[PDB]
């Protein structure tokens, strides 16, 4: 809310950093299990896609205005698993991803960005 | 070519255009065959079985990566009158090669 | 490995290929043994002629 206000009222160029979406999804699953929703794949509620889309899709540039909003979410694939529900859905929403590599990290390489599973 | 054998046969090898020499010991043979295979302008050298049975234990360190000089045990001066046990040799060969003693 | 039914199928296919590779290697080795024994006879024959020469 604050970001969209700044960008599309005072023409700032904003950069949003959301520091862990995994904890967000944990809170979501908790409040969704207390209510007994039809679950998704590992107990995550069935509407988690729509819920995350209402956050990620609040970015971009508007025609006829000078501001902009750019998002850099950060999320930790649980067992380095690209098919876990959270990274899976987030990849289905955002435009590409920057995926880090543990093998490159073990060789002392920084930043351990392997270019093959990344995308923009 | 080259042969590390008794100098009396060495002259016959010279008659066959093959320089040869020897001094009747494994250690001296292994010593100078180092130069011989460094001065290895030929593709094969022979050594009697009595000098040392296996030249691989000797030249294997210096011939590494290179394959031209083939080395083999050849009958000696005792075998000049007696002969050789051909089948025992082949059989102890296939023993280590295909794992077991066969063709018995 | 990510546990999915698709991964299970892929791993099963891998197992099938592994076995069908083992048996092929075995057939090749059998051919090699045939060739090797065919060579050993003429090898000892050349050794015989060398001894008598």
Quickly describe the structure.
The PDB classes it as motor protein. The entry lists the keywords rotary ATPase, V-type ATPase, ATP synthase, Thermus thermophilus, chemo-mechanical coupling, motor protein. The structure is cut from a larger assembly and holds chains A (120 residues), B (104 residues) and C (53 residues). Chain A has 120 residues and is of the alpha+beta class.
How would you describe what is shown here?
This is part of a larger assembly, with chains A (120 residues), B (104 residues) and C (53 residues). Chain A has 120 residues and is of the alpha+beta class. Chain A has helices at 2-10, 21-33, 48-56, 85-93, 102-106, and strands at residues 13-18, 68-73. Chain A starts with a helix and ends in a 14-residue tail after the last helix. Chain B is an alpha/beta fold and 104 residues long. Chain B has one domain. Chain B has helices at 7-15, 26-38, 56-59, 86-97; strands at 2-4, 19-21, 44-48, 70-74. Chain B has a four-stranded parallel β-sheet with strand order 2-1-3-4. The longest helix of chain B has 13 residues, at 26-38. Chain C is an all-alpha fold. In chain C, 91% of the residues lie in helices and 0% in strands. Chain C contains one helix and no strands. Chain C starts with a helix and ends with a helix. Chains in contact: B-C. The PDB classes it as motor protein. Keywords: rotary ATPase, V-type ATPase, ATP synthase, Thermus thermophilus, chemo-mechanical coupling, motor protein. V1EG of V/A-ATPase from Thermus thermophilus, state1-1. Chain A: V-type ATP synthase beta chain.
- The portion of residues assigned to helices of chain B is 25-40%
Helix content of chain C: over 70%
The H-and-E topology of chain B, N to C, reads as: EHEHEHEH
Query: Strand percentage of chain C, roughly?
Result: under 5%
Radius of gyration of chain C: 23 Å
Overall geometry of chain C: rod-shaped
Question: How would you spell out the order of helices and strands of chain C?
Answer: H
PDB class: motor protein
Keywords: rotary ATPase, V-type ATPase, ATP synthase, Thermus thermophilus, chemo-mechanical coupling, motor protein
Entry title: V1EG of V/A-ATPase from Thermus thermophilus, state1-1
Chain A: V-type ATP synthase beta chain
